[PDB]
Amino acid sequence: PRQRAIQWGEDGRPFHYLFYTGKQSYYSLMHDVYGMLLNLEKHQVIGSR
Amino acid sequence: AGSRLETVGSIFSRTRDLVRAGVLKEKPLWFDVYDAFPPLREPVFQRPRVRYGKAKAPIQDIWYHEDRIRAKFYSVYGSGQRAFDLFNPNFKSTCQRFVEKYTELQKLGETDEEKLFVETGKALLAEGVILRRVG
């Protein structure tokens, strides 16, 4: 099975700024999607599931 | 083995004491910074209580002498049809322009209130200001 690698270095500092949420991968994705929706505003089926 | 009794003293006192007792082998990274530059109030838990009987909060209402002039101006002439621009830190409304003229004439020695108010309206009309009385 896929194992997530160690999330902090020898000094103990986590690599990801969203580590302490416990869901850094999920919330980093929501952060990226929310950021894209913002940039659009500033600028402005059958075969897929 | 830091103590989790957050309602007993403060993080500084609990940390300082366990360091003396030898329970904590090393001081935390923040302890020396807190000691050198402590807060104004030591962060000690307190239970908030409702006031009873004749106890009142010590907060006072903020009032100024010019508020009396502003209250009368809004009663007599209403709010100006000009729109407030609260983003401009130096914005002056018709009421503030009225208040400043009212203050100038008061410093010229006039002391009557009803007379000092009518002369102010005339001065602004001479300057081209629109003062539509509400009634």
């Binding site: - | 083995a1 830091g2 103590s3 989790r4 009794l5 609990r14 004491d17 366990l18 007792a21 329970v23």
Partner: protein, 86 residues
């Protein structure tokens, strides 16, 4: 400590207790600094500062706790509800 088995309750209580340690000030490392009289719920505890050699003349549980703190000389009287947790 709570558990179905007694040995598990012992483990939980004692391991948790070290995370909720108080520091108790002692006069000359043997007694309290002043007489302490307080009520906790319905349990009244009156404690008296004592000189060296007086020993622990207190409720047996207070004796046990005082040896863990390091108090050697104190008088205490418990009145009202005698509840171990209170």
């Amino acid at each position: 400590g709570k558990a179905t088995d007694r040995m598990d309750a012992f483990r939980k209580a004692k391991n948790r207790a070290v995370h909720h340690l108080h520091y108790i000030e002692r006069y000359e490392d043997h007694t309290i600094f002043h007489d302490i009289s307080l009520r906790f719920k319905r349990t009244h505890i009156k404690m008296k500062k004592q000189p060296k050699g007086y020993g622990l003349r207190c409720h047996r549980a207070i004796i046990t706790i005082c040896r863990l703190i390091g108090i050697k000389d104190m008088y205490a009287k418990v009145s009202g509800s005698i509840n171990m947790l209170s």
